[PDB]
Specification:
This is part of a larger assembly, with chains A, B, C and D.
Chain A: H1 45-48, E1 69-70, E2 73-76, E3 82-93, E4 98-109, E5 123-126, E6 136-140
Parallel strand pairs in A: 4-6
Antiparallel strand pairs in A: 1-5, 2-3, 3-4, 5-6
Chain B: H1 20-31, H2 42-59, H3 66-70, H4 73-81, H5 108-114
Chain C: E1 41-42, H1 43-51, H2 57-65, E2 69-71, E3 82-83, E4 89-91, E5 97-98, E6 122-124, E7 129-130, E8 136-138, E9 146-147, E10 158-160, E11 171-172, E12 180-182, E13 206-210, E14 216-220, E15 224-226, H3 251-254
Antiparallel strand pairs in C: 1-3, 2-4, 4-5, 6-10, 7-8, 8-9, 10-11, 12-15, 13-14
The chains are: A mainly beta, B mainly alpha, C mainly beta, D little secondary structure.
Chain D binds six RNA strands through strand 1, strand 2 and helix 2.
RNA sequence: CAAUUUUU
RNA sequence: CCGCCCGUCGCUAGUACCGAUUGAAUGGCUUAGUGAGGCCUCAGGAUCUGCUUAGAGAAGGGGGCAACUCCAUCUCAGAGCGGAGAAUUUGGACAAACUUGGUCAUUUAGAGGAACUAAAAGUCGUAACAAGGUUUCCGUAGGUGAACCUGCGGAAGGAUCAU
RNA sequence: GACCCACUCGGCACCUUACGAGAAAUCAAAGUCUUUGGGUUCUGGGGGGAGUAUGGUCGCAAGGCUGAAACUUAAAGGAAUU
RNA sequence: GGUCGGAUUUCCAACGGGGCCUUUCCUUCUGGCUAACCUUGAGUCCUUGUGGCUCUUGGCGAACCAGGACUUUUACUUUGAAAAAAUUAGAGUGUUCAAAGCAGGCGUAUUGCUCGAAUAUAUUAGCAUGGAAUAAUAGAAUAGGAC
RNA sequence: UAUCUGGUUGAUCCUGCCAGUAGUCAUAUGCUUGUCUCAAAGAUUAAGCCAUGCAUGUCUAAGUAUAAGCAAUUUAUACAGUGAAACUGCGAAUGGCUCAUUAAAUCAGUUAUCGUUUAUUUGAUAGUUCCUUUACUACAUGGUAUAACUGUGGUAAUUCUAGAGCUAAUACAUGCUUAAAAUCUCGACCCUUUGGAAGAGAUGUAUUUAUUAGAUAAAAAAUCAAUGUCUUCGGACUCUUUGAUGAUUCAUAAUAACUUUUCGAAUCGCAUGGCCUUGUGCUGGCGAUGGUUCAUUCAAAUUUCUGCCCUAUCAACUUUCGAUGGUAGGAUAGUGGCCUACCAUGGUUUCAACGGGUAACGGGGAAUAAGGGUUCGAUUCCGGAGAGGGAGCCUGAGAAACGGCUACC
RNA sequence: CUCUUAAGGUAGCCAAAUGCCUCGUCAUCUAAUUAGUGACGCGCAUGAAUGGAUUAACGAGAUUCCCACUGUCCCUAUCUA
């Protein structure tokens, strides 16, 4: 979500209490640390070869994934680095012996290394609290659409 | 601040009050063995009710159901430990066929009567 | 709110204590315990209601001043001192030895064990760890940690205790045919010894459990506990033998207990 | 008195969240300490559960790190020049987390040249074989050696000044000093 | 052509 | 049909609705202000102290003419340097309570105005039930004392299912 | 090209008849409804007060839309035979 | 129905369950197991020979485990796990029945003996598993496809 | 356990109300009242007000004893049996009571704490203690600074309180005292450079910072500098070292510093032994309290996942006093626009948000009962809020406590 | 139904600048009110282009009240050209 000397703005943020030896000409000339998510959740190489810092990221920051996991679709990339998710579901009323379609939307913090737009049936995970509202975080996007990678006009 | 102890009512009045022969049918049942009120044929009919309500729910449920094979067989033995009916009607479907005056017949009023010694249910 | 709760009434401890309803009062509240929840029981519930040694609440407190109670060689004159699982409440003079096991009807037991074999408990481990300055240790039912154990055994097995301290002796793993034993829940503690495990990596753990009824069921991991090698068991099981014998022939067995 | 939980603070949709359960004790935020320089006038506070913690006021000498040697000698301070969040804190010369301070250049030089003897920047045989075997190993970087010349070292309070009260942190080394000379060259 | 009221 | 029923008015009664009062009160947000007290902190350092060191009335007497010279005690001292530090008091953040406006909702008081509804045939009349004696009923507009009347496009719950 | 006959589609209706439907009058839909479920929008819970009072909205106005309560009282009523 | 409210040597019909095979259901790479002996060379108690055996040579890795790699997502539904008890239903039970409660009851009452203190039900939320009809369901169109 | 009857009429059929019927773990009330077990009770309206009296205190073999209180009788001839007050520790933060506020708030189930603390309960638990050097000096035991008490006081007053006189410690503050070994830095240096080394000192844990390791899909070599072991002496040789999870910057170890240096027994009880060198020699039982640290336990605190009564004569609520997010901090037991500066304009919605109402505490249930349900649940059990109305705070492990305090009404 | 000459205050409005009686009454404003404002009405003697009623903006028009403000006044003093 950020380019142009990626550690950009007025302050200075870095992966905490890890230092590279400030003179020796070692391999990547940095020590980029990441976190194995586990449970078959393929941590993509965009965090491994990335350059962002983003302490809130589950793949390079100080947050794990320890609660439940949910699903749903994307409706707003209008923010900065977060997207909200509309879980749609049916609901049984006991009286009329019939169902009804309800929903409610939920905000989810997203790592800047991913790529998410409209549609994009997504999988998110429960986290420690990270904003005023965002109680979750995403794990994987892995979703096609109405013929993405194929359509042209 | 304490634990309760429960209570329960063990009769229910009939719904429609006034039919000429129906009140006098339970005057035949009043006049048979010397009752004192109309409440104590309401309560065995109440005991006829929620036993036959209990009898209906196993019969509508499954055959070779062990809940029916337990509380159908333990029901009919407790039905005959008081000895309302004998061994001749022990096949679990005569509990529907049971009639008022048969729950009356094993009461201690009309058992002292039938076993000599009293000459009269009013004396019993 | 605002502090701990140094009382609880009856109806709030579960069925497995078998107290009275119309006492109209507060329950025996367990004290702070070494081992587990209020699904354990304090010793006074084991004495005056199961074993039936006393009536008064002044009475049972007066036994413990005579110093006859003992678990593990430890004094413990606390009245409502909680009692864990398989933690043998040995006695002084009167010489009995009671192991805490589960019978086939929900609540715990009244089961004697012999004089010898009563000098060891049996211990579930929950947490193996290397910690401060290289000192390895295990934990137990009561969390009684033991310095310098048998190295690299794992979490989730059972442990034999030597009762001078921990001084652990023998590891008992889990394999395709051993002893396992439920502890807690709706279908607590008969035997199912194993049939085949699974894992469910990540969320929870389940185990297939095959009775001497020879069907199966599944109880989750926190009730799962291993006894030992199959057909050995370290504890003489109480006289229900761990079946969940069915209610259709529970009734046929108990009038064959009376003979009519 | 000031609270921290969200029984105030208007909800997600935006309703006026009505209140009960007036301001408790288990969320209380103590008023700040906004610490300064001036040599050890520090008071402690009682806290929750049985514990103790340090409000540092007026600190000037504390331990640092290089970090290329693991040295940590208690040197003095001189003052902050660029706070990374806001800018009012340097007009009064306070110190917080990540405060870009300058110190003295002196006490590490007693460590450095007694251990190497080069000598920047322009006796027994047990340690004579030390600098005669660390050839171009003590040498760091040119701009740092130019930065010794004014008699100041750019340091960074990484520790928390008002929670644990220690006078602690490290000094700028590597790319980070180029970040605090991004704008701090052409800021005037 | 015009014809109204006639009274719990 | 010596059937039924329509409206004004008269008397007897009740019912809500409005209404001058820049209405009144309670409660909830509110802008502008005063801000009690308590906390964190800048100072205050009263009044209780001990340490050390330079002189001494009394005499302590390691010895003796006095002396020298031992710490000095009954204690003033002249200096430092700490220890707890109470009133007081600036700054900062919480804020009870109050003042002033505006909104919102509830309740309550009001001179009097038009309505509605009941209630022994009261007069004035027949409007509708038979072609109700001018067929009836709609929507709209106009007049009138009351029913009502008339004009306009309809419709037949019609008094013709019919050239 | 109009017509005669036979057929069919879609109309607008008519006549007979009922098995069927209902309170009856009547009905080819008002049928296939206690042998109760093809979808799908709306409306009504006694008659009065009344399409009235307050509140809103649309109008230049007449007025239109949405729309009670207080009180009142056993019918108002639909069809049919004499 | 063998011979005691009651039991079979194979066998009759139905009920449902599984492995298959029919063009045919087949998550896969690396190992330790294994898992077959269908192997195989020899000996191979008892017969005329793995029907009772071995050292067992490619002698079928994934049913017992964990790594590389994915996997059309849903409803629905079985079972289990699951809701503190009382309360609801409900077996025992001389509280004398009943309201109840959870006891009691049996010897031997000479200084003991044992049964109990059951059982279901509890729906919407979540978890795991069996099922693939019914209703959505998306991956082969400028092939930028599968193998 | 599925039940209906009368009234529009001259009479008939029918839509449709009223009345009639039955129970209330549902209230009041009229009349009547013999037996026996069981038992809710100022919830409904005014969470409006209070007279009076009581509901939180606490002792052992084993804290503090000169009571000028006792009780004695042999003991403890300094005490030891008790025993007030009062100090110290501990409880008071449970229990009980009400439902006014309270409509995604609490709450039912349901995970989460890798994001935290926890006196008490358990179990493990501290061979380094200052290195001013060896006369700092008690480690065979140093100190204050004091209660209760005694003397005379004040005010009419309250669980109000003064100056003076001594003394207690488990209150309070100092403070040593039982090893060895290895490492690192230095140097006494000479004797040499590919060198060694007496000895100057440190090393417990806490605390904060910074670093390193914590690895481990598959097997062999060439190649450039230093070069451990050993030797045929071409040169050759090495088991060369890993805990849990899904995973971590985790537990951890190591390195250099670190603290108005935190802690690491100057406390009491019963017993009397062994020892051989009978010396205030050296050993040694069973406890009781208290203490750091880890893991429990007892709990607290946040937190995901669903469910809500009536209202569109409630149609757009939300921010410049954070509304939503990012950036960096300040506090916090720790998370977080919780708060602060800068930056971005965002959140919810015709699935009903927002606003209003609610005789709305939330649930486990209760009443009537074919099935399908309608209506209560203030009240026995669980959880929440409150102690006349809003604020604020100390003590304590636990409170924004109310039978605790401060101020205003 | 009837008379003076013909037809005999309708829509409305008021003690109004229009109401003598009259400072009419009732309510409201203040501490008090021949003043104000809202209703009353058989109106000496209101009224339909001799125009009747209600009016948004405006008025060097006339009134009554409230809030800020001051020698208007309490209670006057002084200084300047």
């Amino acid at each position: 979500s950020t380019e142009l000397t990626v550690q950009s703005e007025r302050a200075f943020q870095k992966q905490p209490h890890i230092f590279n030896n400030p003179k020796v000409k070692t391999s990547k000339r940095t020590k980029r640390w990441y976190k194995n998510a586990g449970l078959g959740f393929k941590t993509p190489k965009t965090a491994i070869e990335g350059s962002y810092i983003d302490k809130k990221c589950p793949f390079t920051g100080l947050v794990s994934i320890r609660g439940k996991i949910l699903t749903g679709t994307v409706v707003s990339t209008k923010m900065h680095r977060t997207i909200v998710i509309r879980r749609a579901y049916l609901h049984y009323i006991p009286k009329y012996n019939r169902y009804e379609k309800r929903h409610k939307n939920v905000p989810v913090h997203v790592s800047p290394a991913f790529r998410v737009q409209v549609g994009d049936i997504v999988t998110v995970g429960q986290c420690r609290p990270i904003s005023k509202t965002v109680r979750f975080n995403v794990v994987k996007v892995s979703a096609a659409a109405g013929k993405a990678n194929k359509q042209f006009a | 601040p304490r634990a309760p102890r429960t209570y329960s009512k063990t009769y229910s009045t009939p719904k429609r009050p006034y039919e000429s022969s129906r009140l006098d049918a339970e005057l035949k049942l009043a006049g048979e063995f010397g009752l004192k009120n109309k409440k104590e044929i309401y309560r065995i009919s109440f005991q006829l009710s929620k036993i036959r309500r209990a009898a209906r729910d196993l019969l509508t449920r499954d055959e070779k159901d062990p809940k029916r094979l337990f509380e159908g067989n333990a029901l009919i033995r407790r039905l005959v430990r008081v000895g309302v009916l004998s061994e001749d009607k022990k096949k679990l479907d005569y509990v529907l066929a049971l009639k008022v005056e048969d729950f009356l017949e094993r009461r201690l009023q009309t058992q002292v009567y039938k076993l000599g010694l009293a000459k009269s249910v009013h004396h019993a | 709110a605002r502090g701990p709760k140094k009382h609880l009434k009856r109806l709030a401890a579960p069925h497995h204590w078998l107290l009275d309803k119309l006492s109209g009062c507060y329950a025996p509240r367990p004290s702070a315990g070494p081992h587990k929840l209020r699904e354990s029981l304090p010793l006074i519930v084991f004495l005056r209601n199961r074993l039936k040694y006393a009536l008064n609440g002044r009475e049972v407190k007066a036994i413990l001043m005579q110093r006859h109670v003992k678990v593990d060689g430890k004094v413990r004159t606390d009245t409502t001192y909680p009692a864990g699982f398989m933690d043998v409440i040995t006695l002084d003079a009167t010489n009995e030895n009671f192991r805490l096991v589960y019978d086939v009807k929900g609540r715990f037991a009244v089961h004697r064990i012999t004089d010898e074999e009563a000098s060891y408990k049996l211990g579930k481990v929950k947490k193996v760890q290397l910690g401060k300055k290289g000192v390895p240790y295990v934990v137990t039912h009561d969390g009684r940690t033991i310095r310098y154990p048998d190295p690299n055994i794992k979490v989730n097995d059972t442990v034999k205790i030597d009762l001078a301290s921990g001084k652990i002796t023998d590891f008992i793993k889990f394999d395709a045919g051993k002893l396992v034993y439920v502890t807690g829940g709706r279908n607590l503690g008969r035997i199912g010894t194993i049939v085949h495990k699974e894992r469910h990596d990540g969320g929870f753990d389940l185990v297939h459990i095959k009775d001497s009824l020879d069907n199966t069921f599944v109880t989750r991991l926190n009730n799962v506990f291993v006894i030992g090698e199959q057909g050995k068991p370290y504890i003489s099981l109480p006289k229900g033998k761990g079946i969940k014998l069915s209610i259709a022939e529970e009734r046929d067995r108990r009038r064959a207990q009376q003979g009519l | 008195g000031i609270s921290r939980d969200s029984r105030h603070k208007r909800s997600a949709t935006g309703a006026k969240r009505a209140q009960f359960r007036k301001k408790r004790k288990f969320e209380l935020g103590r008023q700040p300490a906004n610490t300064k320089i001036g040599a050890k006038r520090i008071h402690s506070v009682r806290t929750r559960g049985g514990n103790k913690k340090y409000r540092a006021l007026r600190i000037e000498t504390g331990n640092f790190s290089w970090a290329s040697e693991g040295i940590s000698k208690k040197t003095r301070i001189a003052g902050v020049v660029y706070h990374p969040s806001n800018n009012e804190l340097v007009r009064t010369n306070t110190l917080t987390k990540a405060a870009i301070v300058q110190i003295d250049a002196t006490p590490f030089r007693q460590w450095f040249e007694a251990h190497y003897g080069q000598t920047l920047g322009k006796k027994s045989k047990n340690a004579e074989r030390k600098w005669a075997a660390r050839a171009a190993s003590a040498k760091i970087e040119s701009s740092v050696e130019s930065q010794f010349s004014a008699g100041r070292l750019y340091a960074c309070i990484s520790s928390r000044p008002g929670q644990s009260g220690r006078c602690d942190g490290y000094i700028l080394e590597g790319e980070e000093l180029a970040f605090y000379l991004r704008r701090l060259t052409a800021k005037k």
